[PDB]
Design a protein around this ligand. Sequence first.
Ligand SMILES: CCCCCCCCO[C@@H]1O[C@H](CO)[C@@H](O)[C@H](O)[C@H]1O
Ligand SMILES: CCCCCCCCO[C@@H]1O[C@H](CO)[C@@H](O)[C@H](O)[C@H]1O
Ligand SMILES: CCCCCCCCO[C@@H]1O[C@H](CO)[C@@H](O)[C@H](O)[C@H]1O
Ligand SMILES: CCCCCCCCO[C@@H]1O[C@H](CO)[C@@H](O)[C@H](O)[C@H]1O
Lengths: 127, 127
Amino acid sequence: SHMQASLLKVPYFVRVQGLLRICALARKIAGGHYVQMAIIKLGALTGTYVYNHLTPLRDWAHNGLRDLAVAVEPVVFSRMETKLITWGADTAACGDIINGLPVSARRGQEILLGPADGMVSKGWRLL
Amino acid sequence: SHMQASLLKVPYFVRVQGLLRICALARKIAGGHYVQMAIIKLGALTGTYVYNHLTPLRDWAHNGLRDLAVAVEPVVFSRMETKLITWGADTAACGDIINGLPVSARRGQEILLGPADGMVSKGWRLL
Ligand SMILES: CCCCCCCCO[C@@H]1O[C@H](CO)[C@@H](O)[C@H](O)[C@H]1O
Ligand SMILES: CCCCCCCCO[C@@H]1O[C@H](CO)[C@@H](O)[C@H](O)[C@H]1O
Ligand SMILES: CCCCCCCCO[C@@H]1O[C@H](CO)[C@@H](O)[C@H](O)[C@H]1O
Ligand SMILES: CCCCCCCCO[C@@H]1O[C@H](CO)[C@@H](O)[C@H](O)[C@H]1O
């Protein structure tokens, strides 16, 4: 799904499993909390976030990890802004760009990202 | 604003007008189609795309611009993959990352991006 922005063509659920399995290894070592933070941040780069209500830190986290985190929904180690959006097939418009692609047309509750050229003849309407 | 992914805090319609004002300067000069393509590509990396149906090429484009374009809805000069999406408040889920921020919660028709910590208190629900 284009809405997940993952560098890896792998299901989100499975990506979190793999990431936490690497973390589990450091759960009991000395600077283990530092290690996990590193791996979690590396996961973020790949476009994979972990949430406490889905994969409780209590089941894999080193005791010091939670102190390094400034948030666990999802787990992040530096300030990250919080925004509100209402975007939907009903409000989408030209000018909008989603994960790198420009909004170009609509057809029902579907929105076309990228070039729309030659799509009008098929029921798509330009936004 | 977040759904427009523009490096400039300027209305979308104003950004395009500024871009096409520069393009017009080259509408009639020799090799102007090349100059306009550079300008339009600069707009792209800045977050602004132009569409033929919003601002027709016949009003500002140099005669050779169309030939260089691979599409005009919006104007691009190389392959751009076209995607079809179905997404909204009713479908948003964790694992989703929108223009850099992770989906974390839902309240009504609004969706929360970024940390949700402490929001469950305000009537928001983790996804
Ligand atoms: C950070 C990106 C990692 C990408 C590789 C993910 C590999 C996920 O591997 C997963 O491991 C689980 C057990 O840990 C198994 O139960 C799953 O079946 C398996 O697919
Ligand atoms: C790629 C980004 C370009 C930014 C330059 C924007 C220049 C604004 O352009 C001007 O804006 C005014 C109102 O805002 C209009 O009334 C003018 O007609 C228009 O030319
Ligand atoms: C950085 C990319 C710029 C691309 C635009 C190139 C425009 C070439 O501009 C050239 O200027 C010459 C005057 O010296 C004219 O004689 C040529 O006919 C004209 O094509
Ligand atoms: C001042 C001279 C400016 C030349 C304009 C260069 C615009 C670069 O346009 C290119 O567009 C591609 C997608 O279309 C991107 O993937 C490249 O990273 C980007 O460099």
